[PDB]
Every structure is written in structure tokens, then in C-alpha cells.
Amino acid sequence: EDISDYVAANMKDAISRTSGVGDVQLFGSQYAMRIWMNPNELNKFQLTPV
Amino acid sequence: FSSSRWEYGSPRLERYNGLPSMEILGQAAPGKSTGEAMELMEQLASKLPT
């Protein structure tokens, strides 16, 4: 999940737009910004992920 | 609730394809030949920081 972030956002773009280059399916996925809820942490502050 | 400072920021933002552009036109005016120019540029166009 680190080179997946290379490939994807550094190179799936001009691949998939290259000459002849049909579709292009990525194995892995590009960097998200994941933010992981803590259910405890929450009602331990009186908060919904809302 | 606010507070504004000056800064420098850019009025035109390029892109050649996927990536952030930056167009440098020119020409090789009477003398040499349109691929002495290119050549030349490519040349020095692999000096530029990493």
C-alpha cells in the first residue's frame, strides 16, 4: 500500500491514456486519507462519527 | 474571527497531461536548425534539480 500509491497516482494516468491502451485495471488502490473511528473514544466524549 | 497577510501565488496553472505543466516556447532563429535547438534544450533539460 505504498507502491500501489506510486503506480496509481504517479502512472495509471498516462498509461490508461496511452496509445491503443484499452481499459486499465489497477490492483491495489490509490492513497485515501483514512480516518479510523474509535467507538469508545467517541461516546467517551459524547460524539457520533456524524 | 479572521486575519489576512499578503502572499505570492500564481495566476495561471499549467498541465501537460496527468502532470503539472509549464510551457516554454522559443525558436532557433537564423543560423542553426530547429533540432540543434531541441537537442540543445533536452541537453540542459536534464540538469534541472531532481
GROMACS .gro file of N, CA and C in nm:
model
  300
    1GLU      N    1   0.086  -0.124   0.000
    1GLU     CA    2   0.000   0.000   0.000
    1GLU      C    3   0.086   0.124   0.000
    2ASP      N    4   0.195   0.123  -0.074
    2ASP     CA    5   0.286   0.233  -0.066
    2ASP      C    6   0.333   0.253  -0.209
    3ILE      N    7   0.333   0.144  -0.286
    3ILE     CA    8   0.379   0.147  -0.425
    3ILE      C    9   0.255   0.144  -0.504
    4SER      N   10   0.156   0.073  -0.451
    4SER     CA   11   0.025   0.091  -0.502
    4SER      C   12   0.001   0.241  -0.513
    5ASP      N   13   0.049   0.320  -0.416
    5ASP     CA   14   0.027   0.466  -0.424
    5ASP      C   15   0.119   0.528  -0.521
    6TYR      N   16   0.235   0.469  -0.544
    6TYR     CA   17   0.311   0.513  -0.658
    6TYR      C   18   0.229   0.494  -0.786
    7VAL      N   19   0.238   0.372  -0.833
    7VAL     CA   20   0.173   0.332  -0.958
    7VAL      C   21   0.052   0.413  -0.991
    8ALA      N   22  -0.018   0.467  -0.895
    8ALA     CA   23  -0.154   0.482  -0.929
    8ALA      C   24  -0.175   0.624  -0.958
    9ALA      N   25  -0.097   0.701  -0.887
    9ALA     CA   26  -0.127   0.840  -0.888
    9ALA      C   27  -0.003   0.903  -0.945
   10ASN      N   28   0.093   0.815  -0.983
   10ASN     CA   29   0.213   0.864  -1.050
   10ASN      C   30   0.219   0.810  -1.188
   11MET      N   31   0.137   0.709  -1.223
   11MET     CA   32   0.146   0.639  -1.357
   11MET      C   33   0.021   0.569  -1.425
   12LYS      N   34  -0.093   0.562  -1.358
   12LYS     CA   35  -0.204   0.486  -1.415
   12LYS      C   36  -0.268   0.587  -1.502
   13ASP      N   37  -0.217   0.709  -1.495
   13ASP     CA   38  -0.291   0.810  -1.562
   13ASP      C   39  -0.253   0.822  -1.712
   14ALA      N   40  -0.122   0.840  -1.736
   14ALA     CA   41  -0.071   0.837  -1.872
   14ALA      C   42  -0.064   0.696  -1.929
   15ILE      N   43  -0.069   0.587  -1.847
   15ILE     CA   44  -0.087   0.452  -1.906
   15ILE      C   45  -0.222   0.458  -1.969
   16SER      N   46  -0.323   0.463  -1.887
   16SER     CA   47  -0.456   0.445  -1.936
   16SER      C   48  -0.498   0.536  -2.044
   17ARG      N   49  -0.414   0.636  -2.073
   17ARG     CA   50  -0.439   0.738  -2.176
   17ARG      C   51  -0.344   0.724  -2.290
   18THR      N   52  -0.252   0.627  -2.276
   18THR     CA   53  -0.151   0.590  -2.383
   18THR      C   54  -0.211   0.530  -2.514
   19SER      N   55  -0.130   0.514  -2.620
   19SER     CA   56  -0.194   0.484  -2.750
   19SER      C   57  -0.236   0.343  -2.744
   20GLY      N   58  -0.352   0.314  -2.807
   20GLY     CA   59  -0.410   0.172  -2.806
   20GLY      C   60  -0.469   0.107  -2.680
   21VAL      N   61  -0.435   0.169  -2.570
   21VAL     CA   62  -0.446   0.120  -2.437
   21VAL      C   63  -0.592   0.111  -2.380
   22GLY      N   64  -0.661   0.005  -2.416
   22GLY     CA   65  -0.798  -0.013  -2.388
   22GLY      C   66  -0.850   0.049  -2.263
   23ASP      N   67  -0.901  -0.039  -2.173
   23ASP     CA   68  -0.934  -0.011  -2.034
   23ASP      C   69  -0.800   0.005  -1.948
   24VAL      N   70  -0.788  -0.043  -1.825
   24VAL     CA   71  -0.658  -0.041  -1.744
   24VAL      C   72  -0.701  -0.068  -1.599
   25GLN      N   73  -0.681  -0.184  -1.541
   25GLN     CA   74  -0.741  -0.204  -1.412
   25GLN      C   75  -0.634  -0.209  -1.307
   26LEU      N   76  -0.655  -0.138  -1.198
   26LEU     CA   77  -0.546  -0.117  -1.103
   26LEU      C   78  -0.549  -0.218  -0.983
   27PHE      N   79  -0.439  -0.277  -0.944
   27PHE     CA   80  -0.452  -0.380  -0.844
   27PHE      C   81  -0.379  -0.330  -0.722
   28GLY      N   82  -0.455  -0.303  -0.619
   28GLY     CA   83  -0.418  -0.203  -0.522
   28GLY      C   84  -0.515  -0.087  -0.550
   29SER      N   85  -0.493   0.025  -0.480
   29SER     CA   86  -0.569   0.149  -0.499
   29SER      C   87  -0.491   0.263  -0.443
   30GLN      N   88  -0.531   0.377  -0.492
   30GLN     CA   89  -0.454   0.496  -0.476
   30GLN      C   90  -0.475   0.542  -0.333
   31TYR      N   91  -0.377   0.607  -0.275
   31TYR     CA   92  -0.392   0.669  -0.145
   31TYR      C   93  -0.525   0.741  -0.112
   32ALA      N   94  -0.585   0.700   0.001
   32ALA     CA   95  -0.706   0.763   0.055
   32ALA      C   96  -0.652   0.861   0.153
   33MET      N   97  -0.731   0.911   0.247
   33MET     CA   98  -0.677   0.962   0.371
   33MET      C   99  -0.765   0.892   0.460
   34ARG      N  100  -0.724   0.778   0.509
   34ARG     CA  101  -0.813   0.711   0.601
   34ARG      C  102  -0.804   0.769   0.741
   35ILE      N  103  -0.923   0.779   0.800
   35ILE     CA  104  -0.954   0.830   0.934
   35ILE      C  105  -1.042   0.721   1.004
   36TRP      N  106  -0.979   0.646   1.095
   36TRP     CA  107  -1.046   0.532   1.166
   36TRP      C  108  -1.114   0.569   1.297
   37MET      N  109  -1.242   0.542   1.295
   37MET     CA  110  -1.321   0.575   1.409
   37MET      C  111  -1.278   0.477   1.521
   38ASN      N  112  -1.293   0.529   1.644
   38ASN     CA  113  -1.286   0.460   1.773
   38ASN      C  114  -1.418   0.476   1.852
   39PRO      N  115  -1.495   0.368   1.871
   39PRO     CA  116  -1.638   0.373   1.915
   39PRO      C  117  -1.652   0.414   2.056
   40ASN      N  118  -1.565   0.355   2.139
   40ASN     CA  119  -1.522   0.402   2.273
   40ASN      C  120  -1.488   0.554   2.274
   41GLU      N  121  -1.361   0.591   2.250
   41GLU     CA  122  -1.322   0.729   2.206
   41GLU      C  123  -1.430   0.827   2.174
   42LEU      N  124  -1.529   0.781   2.100
   42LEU     CA  125  -1.645   0.862   2.079
   42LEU      C  126  -1.734   0.874   2.206
   43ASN      N  127  -1.830   0.785   2.232
   43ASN     CA  128  -1.918   0.814   2.348
   43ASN      C  129  -1.839   0.846   2.474
   44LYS      N  130  -1.706   0.825   2.473
   44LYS     CA  131  -1.611   0.879   2.574
   44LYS      C  132  -1.581   1.024   2.545
   45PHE      N  133  -1.669   1.092   2.472
   45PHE     CA  134  -1.659   1.235   2.453
   45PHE      C  135  -1.792   1.280   2.409
   46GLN      N  136  -1.884   1.186   2.394
   46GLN     CA  137  -2.022   1.219   2.359
   46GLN      C  138  -2.022   1.270   2.213
   47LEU      N  139  -1.965   1.185   2.127
   47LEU     CA  140  -1.954   1.204   1.978
   47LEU      C  141  -1.985   1.079   1.883
   48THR      N  142  -2.070   1.106   1.782
   48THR     CA  143  -2.103   1.021   1.663
   48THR      C  144  -2.013   1.054   1.539
   49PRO      N  145  -1.987   0.953   1.455
   49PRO     CA  146  -1.891   0.984   1.353
   49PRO      C  147  -1.955   1.087   1.273
   50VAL      N  148  -2.083   1.108   1.304
   50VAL     CA  149  -2.154   1.211   1.236
   50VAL      C  150  -2.081   1.334   1.264
   51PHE      N  151  -1.301   3.707   1.376
   51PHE     CA  152  -1.262   3.565   1.355
   51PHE      C  153  -1.152   3.534   1.244
   52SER      N  154  -1.086   3.637   1.188
   52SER     CA  155  -1.002   3.621   1.069
   52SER      C  156  -0.873   3.686   1.087
   53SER      N  157  -0.800   3.712   0.978
   53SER     CA  158  -0.669   3.782   0.977
   53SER      C  159  -0.583   3.774   0.851
   54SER      N  160  -0.592   3.867   0.758
   54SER     CA  161  -0.528   3.840   0.631
   54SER      C  162  -0.386   3.895   0.608
   55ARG      N  163  -0.286   3.816   0.559
   55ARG     CA  164  -0.142   3.860   0.518
   55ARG      C  165  -0.118   3.878   0.365
   56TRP      N  166  -0.023   3.958   0.316
   56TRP     CA  167  -0.001   3.937   0.172
   56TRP      C  168   0.057   3.790   0.145
   57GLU      N  169   0.048   3.736   0.021
   57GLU     CA  170   0.146   3.645  -0.043
   57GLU      C  171   0.136   3.641  -0.202
   58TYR      N  172   0.232   3.559  -0.251
   58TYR     CA  173   0.256   3.532  -0.389
   58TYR      C  174   0.213   3.396  -0.412
   59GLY      N  175   0.136   3.392  -0.519
   59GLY     CA  176   0.062   3.275  -0.563
   59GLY      C  177   0.038   3.301  -0.710
   60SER      N  178  -0.015   3.201  -0.784
   60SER     CA  179   0.006   3.208  -0.925
   60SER      C  180  -0.124   3.216  -0.993
   61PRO      N  181  -0.129   3.301  -1.097
   61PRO     CA  182  -0.241   3.337  -1.172
   61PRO      C  183  -0.278   3.248  -1.281
   62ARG      N  184  -0.205   3.138  -1.305
   62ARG     CA  185  -0.218   3.051  -1.433
   62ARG      C  186  -0.157   2.927  -1.391
   63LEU      N  187  -0.224   2.816  -1.406
   63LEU     CA  188  -0.159   2.696  -1.354
   63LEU      C  189  -0.150   2.582  -1.463
   64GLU      N  190  -0.028   2.540  -1.503
   64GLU     CA  191  -0.040   2.464  -1.626
   64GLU      C  192  -0.066   2.309  -1.605
   65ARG      N  193  -0.089   2.237  -1.715
   65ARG     CA  194  -0.082   2.092  -1.715
   65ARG      C  195  -0.065   2.037  -1.862
   66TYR      N  196   0.042   1.961  -1.870
   66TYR     CA  197   0.062   1.877  -1.981
   66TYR      C  198   0.034   1.742  -1.930
   67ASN      N  199  -0.090   1.706  -1.942
   67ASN     CA  200  -0.132   1.571  -1.928
   67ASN      C  201  -0.138   1.560  -1.782
   68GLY      N  202  -0.147   1.432  -1.736
   68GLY     CA  203  -0.156   1.397  -1.596
   68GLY      C  204  -0.108   1.513  -1.507
   69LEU      N  205   0.007   1.574  -1.547
   69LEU     CA  206   0.102   1.629  -1.455
   69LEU      C  207   0.108   1.783  -1.449
   70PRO      N  208   0.175   1.843  -1.348
   70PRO     CA  209   0.164   1.988  -1.368
   70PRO      C  210   0.253   2.050  -1.481
   71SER      N  211   0.195   2.108  -1.581
   71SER     CA  212   0.282   2.159  -1.691
   71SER      C  213   0.389   2.256  -1.661
   72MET      N  214   0.428   2.327  -1.768
   72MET     CA  215   0.488   2.463  -1.767
   72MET      C  216   0.553   2.496  -1.905
   73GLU      N  217   0.474   2.567  -1.989
   73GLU     CA  218   0.511   2.585  -2.130
   73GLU      C  219   0.613   2.694  -2.156
   74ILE      N  220   0.723   2.651  -2.221
   74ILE     CA  221   0.839   2.734  -2.262
   74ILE      C  222   0.853   2.728  -2.415
   75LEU      N  223   0.794   2.826  -2.478
   75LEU     CA  224   0.813   2.850  -2.612
   75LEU      C  225   0.942   2.928  -2.628
   76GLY      N  226   0.972   2.953  -2.756
   76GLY     CA  227   1.108   2.985  -2.818
   76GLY      C  228   1.122   2.962  -2.971
   77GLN      N  229   1.225   2.893  -3.019
   77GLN     CA  230   1.265   2.908  -3.156
   77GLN      C  231   1.415   2.908  -3.176
   78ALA      N  232   1.467   2.855  -3.288
   78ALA     CA  233   1.611   2.867  -3.311
   78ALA      C  234   1.663   2.966  -3.421
   79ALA      N  235   1.590   3.077  -3.443
   79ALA     CA  236   1.629   3.194  -3.530
   79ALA      C  237   1.757   3.189  -3.610
   80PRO      N  238   1.755   3.255  -3.732
   80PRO     CA  239   1.853   3.225  -3.846
   80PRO      C  240   1.995   3.178  -3.800
   81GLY      N  241   2.044   3.065  -3.851
   81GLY     CA  242   2.172   3.016  -3.806
   81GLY      C  243   2.153   2.869  -3.804
   82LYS      N  244   2.167   2.809  -3.686
   82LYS     CA  245   2.131   2.666  -3.666
   82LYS      C  246   1.990   2.626  -3.722
   83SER      N  247   1.939   2.512  -3.673
   83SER     CA  248   1.828   2.439  -3.739
   83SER      C  249   1.739   2.385  -3.635
   84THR      N  250   1.611   2.414  -3.641
   84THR     CA  251   1.517   2.359  -3.543
   84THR      C  252   1.545   2.226  -3.457
   85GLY      N  253   1.649   2.150  -3.483
   85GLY     CA  254   1.683   2.033  -3.398
   85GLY      C  255   1.822   2.039  -3.335
   86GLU      N  256   1.883   2.156  -3.346
   86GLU     CA  257   2.002   2.197  -3.273
   86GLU      C  258   1.946   2.261  -3.149
   87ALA      N  259   1.826   2.320  -3.165
   87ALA     CA  260   1.759   2.391  -3.059
   87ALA      C  261   1.714   2.282  -2.959
   88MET      N  262   1.632   2.191  -3.012
   88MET     CA  263   1.571   2.083  -2.936
   88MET      C  264   1.683   2.015  -2.875
   89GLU      N  265   1.760   1.945  -2.952
   89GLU     CA  266   1.877   1.891  -2.895
   89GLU      C  267   1.923   1.978  -2.778
   90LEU      N  268   1.971   2.098  -2.809
   90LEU     CA  269   2.037   2.178  -2.707
   90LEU      C  270   1.961   2.167  -2.572
   91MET      N  271   1.826   2.179  -2.581
   91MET     CA  272   1.734   2.207  -2.467
   91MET      C  273   1.725   2.085  -2.385
   92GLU      N  274   1.690   1.975  -2.452
   92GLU     CA  275   1.689   1.845  -2.387
   92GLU      C  276   1.811   1.828  -2.299
   93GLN      N  277   1.923   1.858  -2.363
   93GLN     CA  278   2.055   1.861  -2.302
   93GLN      C  279   2.055   1.918  -2.160
   94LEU      N  280   2.033   2.050  -2.156
   94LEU     CA  281   2.034   2.122  -2.034
   94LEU      C  282   1.909   2.088  -1.954
   95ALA      N  283   1.807   2.035  -2.023
   95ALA     CA  284   1.681   1.995  -1.960
   95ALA      C  285   1.692   1.860  -1.892
   96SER      N  286   1.815   1.823  -1.863
   96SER     CA  287   1.842   1.713  -1.767
   96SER      C  288   1.958   1.756  -1.667
   97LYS      N  289   1.948   1.880  -1.615
   97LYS     CA  290   2.043   1.945  -1.521
   97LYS      C  291   1.956   1.970  -1.403
   98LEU      N  292   1.834   2.007  -1.434
   98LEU     CA  293   1.742   2.073  -1.351
   98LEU      C  294   1.716   1.981  -1.238
   99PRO      N  295   1.716   2.032  -1.114
   99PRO     CA  296   1.702   1.958  -0.991
   99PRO      C  297   1.623   1.831  -1.008
  100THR      N  298   1.625   1.747  -0.907
  100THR     CA  299   1.561   1.619  -0.922
  100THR      C  300   1.410   1.618  -0.931
   0.00000   0.00000   0.00000
